[PDB]
Structures are given as structure tokens and as C-alpha cells.
Amino acid sequence: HWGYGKHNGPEHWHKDFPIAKGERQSPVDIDTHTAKYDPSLKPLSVSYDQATSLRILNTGYLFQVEFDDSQDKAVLKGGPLDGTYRLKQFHFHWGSLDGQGSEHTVDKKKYAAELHLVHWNTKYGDYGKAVQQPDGLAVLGIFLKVGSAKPGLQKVVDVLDSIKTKGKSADFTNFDPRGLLPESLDYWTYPGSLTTPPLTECVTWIVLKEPISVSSEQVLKFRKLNFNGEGEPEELMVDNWRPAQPLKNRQIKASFK
Ligand SMILES: CCCSc1c(F)c(F)c(S(N)(=O)=O)c(F)c1F
Ligand SMILES: CCCSc1c(F)c(F)c(S(N)(=O)=O)c(F)c1F
Ligand SMILES: [Zn+2]
């Protein structure tokens, strides 16, 4: 199966998922000097006041926190989006070293990790339909740098030892994703794709300019997870990021400056 290694990593994915070589692949390098300020973009509206987390899961590729998306609770709207997108899950990608781990880059700068909050377009009724459509998903991306601890991340960090291996889950209720946001909602936006197979071109990317700070100890705990399942040989879950893909004809828009 696909993964992040020499044998089955990003450079191999095209053989099972030919859209890997498509015209709107993600992530990309964000060249801050060619991005266009767009005074017509709206401020993002991130409404997470009624978010209901359910569960945290080690998928064998990453870990994800899942939300009850059976009602209009936690929604993203505004900015470049038409309509209303419902929060389904967040997850992270991270490095073996603090020097790498993010999927998007900024003027070629790699961050230690990248948080993705995945939302689906409620015009399509549910996630499984939405992920098939060109404007099905909106993913909010937030860079992590290593520095001061992020207090709102600690509840996540502390549960990871209960989901060390592929397929493990744990109840994860009452987690507030507002704790993971930076102060500023200034963003870049561009049309792209899932960054993991099946690499579908269904994503409007919204990448915040301001990183959040996490401690060395918090990211260290991400790196103790395992790609493998229980009772299989230990492979640390590190470097689960796809490198930047060709921008092709696309324009990155900035909400600011
Ligand atoms: C023997 C186990 C690895 S075989 C393999 C593979 F090499 C891939 F590149 C892929 S891919 N194109 O999905 O990365 C794959 F699914 C595989 F099963
Ligand atoms: C694979 C599709 C099922 S889960 C998923 C996803 F929805 C994403 F948007 C992304 S991402 N990285 O494009 O936000 C992701 F990595 C995922 F694993
Ligand atoms: Zn992701």
C-alpha cells in the first residue's frame, strides 16, 4: 500500500493515483511575492463554538480527531468560499526533525508540522459525496513552529500514547479546536487537492499566515506514534508529509497586505 517510505512514498503514488501528476495538486510552495492581494476576499468565518469532538484515531498515516458532523455545528464560511463547509476532522503532518514536516512551504520555508482542519461543502449532503466534487472540501491549514507550548494542544498530546499503533482509537470528547488557532486569520488561498491518496482535486486550500507555537516536547510526542499496527515491527510515524507540487497555472490569493 501507499505510505511515506522510499518504497511507497510520494514519488510512487502516481502509479495507483494518476491524478498525482494533475493540474491542481497540493501542497505547493507559497511564493509570498507572487501571491496577489485580493481586496474582494471576505474575512474567514470560523464558527467552532458548538464543535463536538468524538474520537481520536491513528489511521496508519497520521492521527485525526473526528467531529460529529451530523448537524450544522462547527462551520467555516466566507473568505473564498461559496456556501457553508462543515468541520469533519482535523489532523497533522510532521517531521522527524524540527526543520521539516509541513506540507505547504512559505518562500520555501518548511515548518515542523502542519495542522489541517477538514471541512465539507454542505450543498453535497455528506462528506463521501463532497470529496468527489471539485469544490467539495475546504481545508484550513495552520503551520506549527517549535517554541513555546500550545496549551490547547496538550489534551491531544496526552492521549497519543493510547493510540500508538495503526487502527487504535480513543474517545475524545469536549475538545475545543479553537485552542489550536493563531491570533490572526490572515490567509492565502488557492485551488488544490487532497495531499494523500486518492489525491482528488476537491480542495479549496486556506492556509493561515501566522503559525502557532508548539513545544519541542509536544512535537516529540507526535514522533512516538507508529505507522505500523500492534504486534508488527516498529516504524516511527515521522515525515508523513507530501513535498510541494508544481503550481501549474494557478494563482495564490492573499487576504492581506
Ligand atoms: C510490497 C508492499 C509495497 S508495494 C506498493 C508500492 F510499492 C507502491 F508504490 C504503492 S502506491 N502507488 O500506492 O504507493 C502500493 F500501493 C504498493 F502496494
Ligand atoms: C484521504 C481522504 C480521507 S482523510 C483526509 C482528508 F480528508 C484530507 F483532506 C486530507 S488533507 N492533507 O488534504 O487535508 C488528508 F490528509 C486526509 F487524510
Ligand atoms: Zn493533511
**Residues sharing a CB contact under 8 Å with residue 251, sequence separation 6 or more, in sequence order:** 35, 36, 190
Transcribe 40-91 into DSSP letters: TPPPEEEE-TT--EEEEEE-SS-EEEEE--SSS-SEEEETT-SSEEEEEEEE
The residues spanned by each domain of the chain are 1-257
Cβ–Cβ under 8 Å, residues 114 and 92: yes
Q: Is the shortest distance between the CB of 225 and ligand 2 below 6 Å?
A: no
Query: What residue type is 24 in one-letter code?
Result: R
Q: What CA–CA distance (Å, rounded) separates 134 from 127?
A: 13
Q: What CA–CA distance (Å, rounded) separates 134 from 213?
A: 33
Give the distance (Å) from ligand 1 centre to CA of residue 9.
Answer: 8
Cα 143 to the center of its chain, rounded Å: 9
- Determine which helix (DSSP H) or strand (DSSP E) holds 191, and give its type and residue range: strand 187-192
Q: Is the shortest distance between the CB of 1 and ligand 1 below 6 Å?
A: yes
List the residue whose alpha carbon is closest to atom 5 of ligand 1: 1
Q: What CA–CA distance (Å, rounded) separates 184 from 257?
A: 13
Q: Residue 193 CA: which ligand 2 atom is closest? A: 13
